[PDB]
Amino acid sequence: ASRLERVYQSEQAEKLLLAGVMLRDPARFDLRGTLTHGRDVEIDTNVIIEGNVTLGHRVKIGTGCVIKNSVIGDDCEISPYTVVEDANLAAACTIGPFARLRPGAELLEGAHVGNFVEMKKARLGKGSKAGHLTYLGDAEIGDNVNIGAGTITCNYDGANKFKTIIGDDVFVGSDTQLVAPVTVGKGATIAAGTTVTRNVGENALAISRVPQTQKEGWRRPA
Amino acid sequence: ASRLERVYQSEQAEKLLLAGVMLRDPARFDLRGTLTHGRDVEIDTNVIIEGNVTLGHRVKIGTGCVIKNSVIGDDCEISPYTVVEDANLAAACTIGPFARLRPGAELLEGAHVGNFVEMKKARLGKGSKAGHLTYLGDAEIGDNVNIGAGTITCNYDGANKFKTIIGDDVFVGSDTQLVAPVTVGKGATIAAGTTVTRNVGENALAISRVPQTQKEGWRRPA
Amino acid sequence: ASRLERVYQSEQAEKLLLAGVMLRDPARFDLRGTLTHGRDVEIDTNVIIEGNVTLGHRVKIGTGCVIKNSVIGDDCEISPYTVVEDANLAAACTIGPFARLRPGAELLEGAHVGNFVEMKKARLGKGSKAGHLTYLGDAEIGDNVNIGAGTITCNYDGANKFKTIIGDDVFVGSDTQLVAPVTVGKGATIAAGTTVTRNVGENALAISRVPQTQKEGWRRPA
Ligand SMILES: COc1cc(OC)c(S(=O)(=O)N(c2ccccc2)c2ccc(N)cc2)cc1NC(=O)CCC(=O)O
Ligand SMILES: COc1cc(OC)c(S(=O)(=O)N(c2ccccc2)c2ccc(N)cc2)cc1NC(=O)CCC(=O)O
Ligand SMILES: COc1cc(OC)c(S(=O)(=O)N(c2ccccc2)c2ccc(N)cc2)cc1NC(=O)CCC(=O)O
């Protein structure tokens, strides 16, 4: 029953400790499947490992993380309250806190995913960053790309899903909508707030912006 | 004191186990009020139940959830780190992870609320979806509606709050602002990135989009 | 080892209880550094205190919070799953749930930060509110300001970071992009969805909006 399975958790935690994993609290750790690990792995409180998971050397997992059927490279840092399912992280990635990686999430070396970011069937290239308030679905994102806060892939049209491709060295300004299918060429810049409905050339700016105007002495409702 | 109340928690957890609830860890469960439940209910670690809560049959509650004064229908799945207060879920709803339902949140049968979604005094209809990065306040949303990632109800003008009504079979494109009060007719489509300031007719597209343009050889600051 | 350090945690929790702090579960509390507190402080389950932290009187900390090197004024309420690092809260602030305050976050008296909000090197003035789905970086925000859902400071141009200044009594409509450096004068109103690329005068409306239009009988892909 509940109590018996809980005892089995204690057993796994003890064995992990003996195998050289640093568990901050063995009473607040759960493994529901199998865990392979390198050396100097640190796991904080209330972490749940599900399915078949492998961790490299020096991986640090912060409080409250849920990691299911995932492969985590050496030196990765997973910050608090991050949920990871069927994902692969290369070496030296940093994700979270409050990141949500869904199946097909693939991060290349040194990639960063910040708070309130969701990834599904999406690859984030080497040294690339998606720091805030972003949804990346059905997307290929190249190396050295900056995905600005509020960026969203419009991948689903109510019927089908379509693919977004972003080249290397692209800057995606904040609050950009990438309307799939679309391709953004290497070195391109998307202006903040752009709705990208057409492919963008290499080294080109894409923009869809009304010039700002001002009305004086404008009074809000009382 | 602290320790005495903690003992009372152990008691409630034990009684829940005896009554047929599956608690993954009775030592990491809190009930501060009253819990009614059906059969085959599963509650993961670090769940807190507050006030008066009722759960149907086969409800699954993932790690770290906080559920206060709420009614949860049969077969609902509440994913990790979801906060629910004074809400009602019909049968077969799926919410979270990282969903925040505030008082007046009402989900009809089979509704879905995803990550980084907040609902307050808002009804989400049958089979309707709000999957990502969305705020729905003071809103009626019909059946079979797709609420795209980044959608926001602009409900508060600094003085008062106003109501948004969205009909059945509406597609709301990503990053739409619904400027209340506003009504979107059944079958309508809102283009991604639209600022909806006027009512939308049945079976109509609403759009407010600058055509994309491109400037070649555009160099970002060094 | 793990077990020894865990014993030291039990010790600190016991001492906190004896010093008049209400810990909901002393077995689910962690202090990694030093904690100073006033009277009637309440700390819920799975809270982690890191570095050197000071709390005023009547501070309430909800489940799962992580508070590092921060100063929390009297009567503050920190809601569940909120991460706070190198921040200062004045009296009577309310933050979270799912708020993420990074170093340099400074909240003045009675300020509110809601769910899925991130702050970094940003000051939020007296009685000011950032309730939802927002990133505020490198920003000064005055008193009695409403920061609408979906607001983002565009602070980083790929090379450098720039400062946003928002005056007192400003209403920032939902989904506004503040393109730094920029200054918004006292009493100004930013329309929902505006991309603010130019300074805004006192008591002025700033807007960058395509008028909504409609196409009848528009059929989505099958
Ligand atoms: C200071 O930061 C910016 C300035 C700026 O603008 C100052 C523009 S812009 O998009 O308006 N823009 C631009 C883009 C890249 C580099 C420099 C400027 C731009 C585009 C076209 C025109 N005509 C003017 C500015 C964008 C940003 N920053 C972001 O979008 C942040 C992304 C993130 O969250 O990491
Ligand atoms: C591929 O996905 C889209 C394509 C598209 O566009 C391809 C438009 S659109 O809005 O630009 N658009 C449209 C809308 C619905 C169905 C098909 C197209 C549209 C509207 C007007 C015009 N003239 C062209 C396209 C929107 C989306 N998707 C979303 O908005 C995702 C919502 C979510 O997160 O679930
Ligand atoms: C009902 O709420 C609104 C109405 C409205 O609009 C009704 C506009 S508006 O921006 O379109 N607008 C406006 C702004 C402030 C007060 C009243 C109206 C506005 C601006 C210019 C013009 N011409 C018309 C309306 C904005 C809001 N609300 C928000 O943006 C919510 C912010 C939040 O999340 O707290």
Resolution (A): 1.9
Phi, psi torsion values for B180, nearest 5 degrees: -80, 150
- In the block, which residue shows the tokens 């009547």? C58
Question: Which residues on adjacent β-strands are paired with residue C5?
Answer: none
* Rg for chain B, CA atoms, rounded: 21
Q: How far is the CA of A131 from the centre of ligand 1 (A)?
A: 16
* Residue length of chain A: 222
Of C26, C175, C214, which has the smallest distance from its Cβ to B200's Cβ? C214
Q: Is C114 on the interface with B (CB under 8 A)?
A: yes
Which pair of tokens denotes residue A9?
């958790």
| Chain C CB within 8 Å of residue A22 CB | yes
Nearest residue to B139 (alpha-carbon basis) of B159, B157, B109, B118:
B118
C149 is in an annotated binding site: yes
Specify the residue for token string 């229908």.
B73
Interface mutation vs chain B, best among C28, C48, C100, C174, most B CBs within 10 Å? C174
Cβ separation of C115 and B133 shorter than 8 Å? no
Inter-chain residue contact A64 with B81, CB threshold 8 Å:
yes
Burial B127-149 (b: 16+ CB within 10 A, else e): bbbbbbbbbbbbbbbbbbbbbbb
Whether A177 and B150 lie within 8 Å, measured CB to CB: yes
Q: Which helix (H) or strand (E) covers residue A201, if one does?
A: none
CA B154 / ligand 3 centre spacing (Å): 7
Spell A98-126 as b/e; 16+ CB within 10 A means b.
bbbbbebbbbbbbbbbbbbbbbbbbbbbb
Interchain contact, C196 vs A175, CB within 8 Å:
no
Set of chain B residues whose Cβ sits within 8 Å of the Cβ of C144:
none
| Distance between CA atoms of residues A104 and A87, nearest Å | 6
Other beta carbons within 10 angstroms of residue A39's beta carbon come to 12
Going along A169-221, which residue ranges are E strands?
171-172, 177-179, 182-184, 189-190, 195-196, 205-207, 213-215
Tell me how long chain B is. Answer: 222
Contact yes or no for B173/B194 (Cβ under 8 A): yes
**Per-residue DSSP letter, B3:** H
Those residues whose C-beta lies under 8 Å from the C-beta of residue C104, and which sit 6 or more positions away, are C86, C87, C120, C121, C122
HSE-CB at C1 with a 13 A cutoff on CA atoms is 9
Domains in chain A with CATH codes: 1-207 (2.160.10.10)
- Let me know: does C175 contact C150? Beta carbons within 8 Å: yes
Q: Which of B152, B212, B216, B219 to mutate to test the interface with A (most CBs of A within 10 A)?
A: B212
As for ligand 3, residues whose beta carbon falls within 6 Å of it are: A 220-221; B 154-158, 162, 179-180; C 146, 148-149, 171, 173-174, 189, 191-192, 205, 207
Instruction: Give the containing element (helix H, strand E) for C80.
Output: none
Which of B58, B54, B48 lies closest to B21 in space, CA to CA? B58
Residues on chain C touching B205 (C-beta within 8 angstroms): 214-215, 218
Instruction: Confirm or reject contact between B12 and chain A (CB < 8 A).
Output: no
> Omega into C181 within 30° of 0, i.e. cis?
yes
Q: How far is the CA of A175 from the centre of ligand 3 (A)?
A: 19
Residues of A in contact with B113 (CB under 8 A): none
User: Which residues touch C176 (CB under 8 Å, ≥6 apart)?
Assistant: C148, C150, C151, C152, C190, C191, C192, C193, C194, C195, C196
Find the residue in A nearest to B17 (Cα).
A2
* DSSP 8-state code for residue B196: E
Distance CA C70, CA C195 (A): 33
CA-closest candidate to residue A187, choices B214, C177, C154, C156:
B214
Residue C48 near chain B (CB below 8 Å): no
Taking Cα atoms as reference points, which of C72, C47, C79 lies closest to residue C57?
C72
For residue B222, count CB atoms less than 10 angstroms from its CB and return exposed for 0-12, middle for 13-18, buried for 19 or more: exposed
Pairwise CB contact (< 8 Å): C177 & A28 = no
If one counts every other C-beta atom within 10 angstroms of the C-beta of residue C19, the result is 11
Atom of ligand 2 nearest to the CA of A180: 1
When computed from its CA atoms, the radius of gyration of chain A, rounded to whole angstroms, is 21
- Candidates A54, A17, B156; CA nearest to C173 is B156
Please indicate whether, in this complex, the C-beta atoms of B195 and C218 are within 8 angstroms of each other: no
The Cα–Cα gap between B220 and C17 comes to 56
> Nearest to residue A116, comparing CAs of C134, C102, C77?
C134
Residue minimizing CA distance to atom 35 of ligand 1 = A148
- Rounding to the nearest 10 degrees, give the CA dihedral for residues B84, B88, B93, B99: -20
The total of other beta-carbon atoms located within 10 Å of residue C110's CB is 18
